[PDB]
Design a protein around this ligand. Structure first.
Ligand SMILES: [Ca+2]
Ligand SMILES: [Ca+2]
Ligand SMILES: [Ca+2]
Ligand SMILES: [Ca+2]
Lengths: 19, 148
């Protein structure tokens, strides 16, 4: 797994709570 | 020869099991609520239902493999990659000191549901440790992400 690939999934966690 | 983007879609297949603890192929507001607490807190089964309604292509009440992917590309497009990076960094920096830490990386991976050795966490630091300080600063964090 690449570190950059993991960062993309983390950005999704906060967006879900945004709405 | 107009190729497709199914190569990237393969990556999301391996991530879907991580989000679905039951490995049954579907995520329910209850299951995801556990992830929300780890980010800060749990929303409400009432509000959680509205979020899925806007993304429910069939309207069954849950998100399937193909439904989850359509929402991901729709959210990032209307948003900016700079915004998703700022949110992710703030989540890893729980102490908010300016950089992450070996203990900070391990706490999230274990909370996510993956088991790695402390040595696995150290290498992650090496990838973004351009200055060689042993810790990833804000500047090193963004450069490695937008390296190419
Ligand atoms: Ca499930
Ligand atoms: Ca659905
Ligand atoms: Ca920190
Ligand atoms: Ca460094």
């Amino acid at each position: 797994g690449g570190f950059r690939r993991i960062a993309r999934l983390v950005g999704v966690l906060r967006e879900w709570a945004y709405r | 020869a107009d190729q497709l983007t199914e190569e990237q879609i393969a990556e999301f297949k391996e991530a879907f099991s991580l989000f679905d603890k039951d490995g049954d192929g579907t995520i329910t507001t209850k299951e995801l609520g556990t992830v929300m607490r780890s980010l800060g807190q749990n929303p409400t089964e009432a509000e959680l239902q509205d979020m899925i309604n806007e993304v429910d292509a069939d309207g069954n009440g849950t998100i399937d493999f193909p439904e989850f992917l359509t929402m991901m590309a729709r959210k990032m497009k209307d948003t900016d990659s700079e915004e998703e990076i700022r949110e992710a960094f703030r989540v890893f920096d729980k102490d908010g000191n300016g950089y992450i830490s070996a203990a900070e990386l391990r706490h999230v991976m274990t909370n996510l549901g993956e088991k790695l050795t402390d040595e696995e966490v150290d290498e992650m630091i090496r990838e973004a440790d351009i200055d060689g300080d042993g810790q990833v600063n804000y500047e090193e964090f963004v450069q490695m992400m937008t390296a190419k």
